[PDB]
Amino acid sequence: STAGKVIKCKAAVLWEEKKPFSIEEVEVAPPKAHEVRIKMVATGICRSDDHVVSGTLVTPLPVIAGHEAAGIVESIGEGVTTVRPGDKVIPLFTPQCGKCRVCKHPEGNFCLKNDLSMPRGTMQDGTSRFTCRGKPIHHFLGTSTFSQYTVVDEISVAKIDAASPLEKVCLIGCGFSTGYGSAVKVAKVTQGSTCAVFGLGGVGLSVIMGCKAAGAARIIGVDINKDKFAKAKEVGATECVNPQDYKKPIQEVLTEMSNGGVDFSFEVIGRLDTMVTALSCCQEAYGVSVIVGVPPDSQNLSMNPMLLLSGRTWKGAIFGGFKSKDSVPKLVADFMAKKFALDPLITHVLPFEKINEGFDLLRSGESIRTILTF
Amino acid sequence: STAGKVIKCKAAVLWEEKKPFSIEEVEVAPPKAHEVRIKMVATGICRSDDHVVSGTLVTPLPVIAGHEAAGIVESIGEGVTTVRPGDKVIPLFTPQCGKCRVCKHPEGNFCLKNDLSMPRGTMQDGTSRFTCRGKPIHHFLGTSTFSQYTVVDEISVAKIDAASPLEKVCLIGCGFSTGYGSAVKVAKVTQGSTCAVFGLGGVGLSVIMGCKAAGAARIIGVDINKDKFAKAKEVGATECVNPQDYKKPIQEVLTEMSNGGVDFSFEVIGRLDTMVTALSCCQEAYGVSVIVGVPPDSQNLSMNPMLLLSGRTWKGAIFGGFKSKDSVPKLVADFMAKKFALDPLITHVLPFEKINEGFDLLRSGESIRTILTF
Numbered sequence A, B: 001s002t003a004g005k006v007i008k009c010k011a012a013v014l015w016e017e018k019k020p021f022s023i024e025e026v027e028v029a030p031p032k033a034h035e036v037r038i039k040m041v042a043t044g045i046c047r048s049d050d051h052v053v054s055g056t057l058v059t060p061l062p063v064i065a066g067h068e069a070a071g072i073v074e075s076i077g078e079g080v081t082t083v084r085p086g087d088k089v090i091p092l093f094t095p096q097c098g099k100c101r102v103c104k105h106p107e108g109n110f111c112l113k114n115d116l117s118m119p120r121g122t123m124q125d126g127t128s129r130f131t132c133r134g135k136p137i138h139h140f141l142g143t144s145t146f147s148q149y150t151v152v153d154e155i156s157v158a159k160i161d162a163a164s165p166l167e168k169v170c171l172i173g174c175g176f177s178t179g180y181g182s183a184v185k186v187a188k189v190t191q192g193s194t195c196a197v198f199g200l201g202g203v204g205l206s207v208i209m210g211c212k213a214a215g216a217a218r219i220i221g222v223d224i225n226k227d228k229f230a231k232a233k234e235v236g237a238t239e240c241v242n243p244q245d246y247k248k249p250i251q252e253v254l255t256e257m258s259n260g261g262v263d264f265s266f267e268v269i270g271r272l273d274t275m276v277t278a279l280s281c282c283q284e285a286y287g288v289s290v291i292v293g294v295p296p297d298s299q300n301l302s303m304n305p306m307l308l309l310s311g312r313t314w315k316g317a318i319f320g321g322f323k324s325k326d327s328v329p330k331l332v333a334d335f336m337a338k339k340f341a342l343d344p345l346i347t348h349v350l351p352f353e354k355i356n357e358g359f360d361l362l363r364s365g366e367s368i369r370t371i372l373t374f
């Protein structure tokens, strides 16, 4: 029995940038008031986790990363009302406190209790529940899913369907919901429209899924890796283009292809240049461009504001614009009701012990999502 | 008495950047097919006309500027169906061809026949109707309202109420409609919201009018010229701030004043720095910022796309997002029915012959709108 006790378990600790994860024993404290300790079942490898490794994202180290996952509640702290031991849950890397101005806003999801903007790498109370070799280890986004057990704040966990297949619905914790919501909720893609999707990884494929669900007539996938095009077409891309195949800049190609610009474009890579290209390729008077990718820390882009003055809309979003705790259970219910598919995003399924191999598959271009199983 | 004949009249010709206008005789050719020759009655001095003088806005010289005006049709060319001789009209600097993909789109207004994006300084047929000293003179935005007579394409003119006071409703041809629409149509300001308006000239005052019409609870005016604040409060500002009064950047001041960022911000100046400041000061998860000011030619801004990733929406618009030929007559009808006021924008009246004094009044900071009478 582990309730109220320190757990010694296995986790993937990142001690410093640009090094492999170290799979080793950590101590996980029991949950405090309004905290939940979760036995992990499955976690996806998102590019954002690789950004911590590469230094693209700055967050305090050493750290237990991982933010796309699903597991089963092991124990709850005093005052928890929304989950119980044995519940299937998804950790929420964007929390939903329910009390801040953003949570109360009909269109806000970026709760002010997040640990993204200005990361502390702690629980809400400014402390850590992790130690390794006698040293405190930072949390990541309130989730830290690269561990057999984590502790999260109640506002960072959602109860989901008890019959959920956790090795699939873990993707609702980041990449599926992000891409699908970027299309259906943030962009509000319209029936009959033309979309361009820059980056055909797990998140970009989810954007395609959402564009097709919304009834887009044309969905143009853009990637420098042509090995990504077959799966993009399977999930709804009508065309794919590789910028490297063209003498012209791709914004010009896409403007030509769309007879004057696309209705909706999405940056799903994380490069400053592709953010500006994606904006430019949407029709100048009524186009919408959504930034989804995460670019290198503290770098500014350059752009001509005439692109906006003519009438373009430029926006971005975290987690597809979804209010996390309200939406995650509904998305799992919709998956259970066959309203969308997750299998097209899953290319590899590895034990957790092969986390490094899973990151090498992402870096080499081979994988979409690797699911690690505990 | 002049139908089919060249008209000799006075115009304000700009031969060179950074020089006074030259009031002198020009020849105005009769209208060709689908053209309309207009006897001007009143024209406003908009900062965009001053941009042509300063080189902020690049358009071919020599030129007859002016784009905010009203007049009476003198004659129509073959095939014109939408106006007749003797009709009161407003020239439309943003055309409405009614046929292009933008005109057909429910939210588009930046018609593809515009002469703004890549100015030619011609009629739609690529030629000029103006001669001065035997030399061809450029048009400006298809309107060229700084002339006793102009010729415009039919898609660039709207028939308005025959009982219209032309010395007021000229402002519907640019500054009022731009600012009002930027609030009510482009931003879609909501009841109870907090707005910030950067720049309190005729366009920013019109933005305030729209934010007040929309029910905003707080409207914060921002200007470095504190002489602008009294009128801004008369038309709806709840409070005004001068960035020069503060040690901290005004985006930080405005974020503090709004307990975490404003719902809606407007850049109504034309500076790259205030475009980024205005974006920054809107709430990071659900704020909306609208660029209205005209940026300096060919210059890029620098900004961190994390401002957008958190959830902000950034857009711009020409002419308040209004489809010009549909909207201008309705706006005049609404003015006739006292649905909005134009007098708060008019600070000075001068004869056309005193156009240079009118530009001096704008450059000194004294005026909002000077209305020139022919």
Ligand SMILES: NC(=O)c1ccc[n+]([C@@H]2O[C@H](COP(=O)([O-])OP(=O)([O-])OC[C@H]3O[C@@H](n4cnc5c(N)[nH+]cnc54)[C@H](O)[C@@H]3O)[C@@H](O)[C@H]2O)c1
Binding pocket: A045, A046, A047, A048, A051, A174, A175, A178, A198, A199, A200, A201, A202, A203, A204, A222, A223, A224, A225, A228, A243, A268, A269, A270, A271, A274, A291, A292, A293, A294, A295, A317, A318, A319, A320, A365, A367, A368, B309
């Ligand atoms: N906004 C959010 O809430 C959120 C959520 C999840 C992921 N992300 C970010 O979204 C991005 C995509 O994540 P992912 O799908 O896991 O990554 P991924 O699986 O690495 O996919 C990226 C794709 O971009 C392609 N690519 C790389 N460079 C270019 C280029 N120059 N032109 C066109 N294609 C290019 C690359 O070949 C790959 O297929 C990353 O920056 C993530 O950090 C953001």
Ligand SMILES: NC(=O)c1ccc[n+]([C@@H]2O[C@H](COP(=O)([O-])OP(=O)([O-])OC[C@H]3O[C@@H](n4cnc5c(N)[nH+]cnc54)[C@H](O)[C@@H]3O)[C@@H](O)[C@H]2O)c1
Binding pocket: A309, B046, B047, B048, B051, B174, B175, B178, B198, B199, B200, B201, B202, B203, B204, B222, B223, B224, B225, B228, B243, B268, B269, B270, B271, B274, B291, B292, B293, B294, B295, B317, B318, B319, B320, B368
């Ligand atoms: N998008 C459109 O369709 C459209 C239409 C009309 C006007 N414009 C542009 O809108 C802008 C405003 O035009 P307008 O109202 O006629 O001009 P204006 O009367 O010159 O007003 C501009 C205001 O900005 C103030 N200002 C200048 N610098 C700063 C600063 N650093 N911070 C704060 N305030 C400052 C200035 O004191 C003045 O009151 C100009 O750039 C026009 O070219 C655009």
Ligand SMILES: OCc1c(F)c(F)c(F)c(F)c1F
Binding pocket: A046, A047, A048, A049, A057, A067, A093, A116, A141, A174, A294, A318, A319, B309
């Ligand atoms: O993939 C989701 C994701 C983000 F969108 C971020 F902006 C971020 F900083 C991060 F750490 C993250 F995991």
Ligand SMILES: OCc1c(F)c(F)c(F)c(F)c1F
Binding pocket: A309, B046, B047, B048, B049, B057, B067, B093, B116, B141, B174, B294, B318, B319
């Ligand atoms: O004031 C309206 C106005 C604009 F918004 C422009 F973008 C522009 F180029 C121009 F010439 C103009 F007059």
Ligand SMILES: [Zn+2]
Binding pocket: A095, A096, A097, A098, A099, A100, A101, A102, A103, A111, A112, A113
């Ligand atoms: Zn909250």
Ligand SMILES: [Zn+2]
Binding pocket: A046, A047, A048, A049, A067, A068, A174, A175
């Ligand atoms: Zn992610």
Ligand SMILES: [Zn+2]
Binding pocket: B095, B096, B097, B098, B099, B100, B101, B102, B103, B111, B112, B113
């Ligand atoms: Zn048109």
Ligand SMILES: [Zn+2]
Binding pocket: B046, B047, B048, B049, B067, B068, B174, B175
């Ligand atoms: Zn103007």
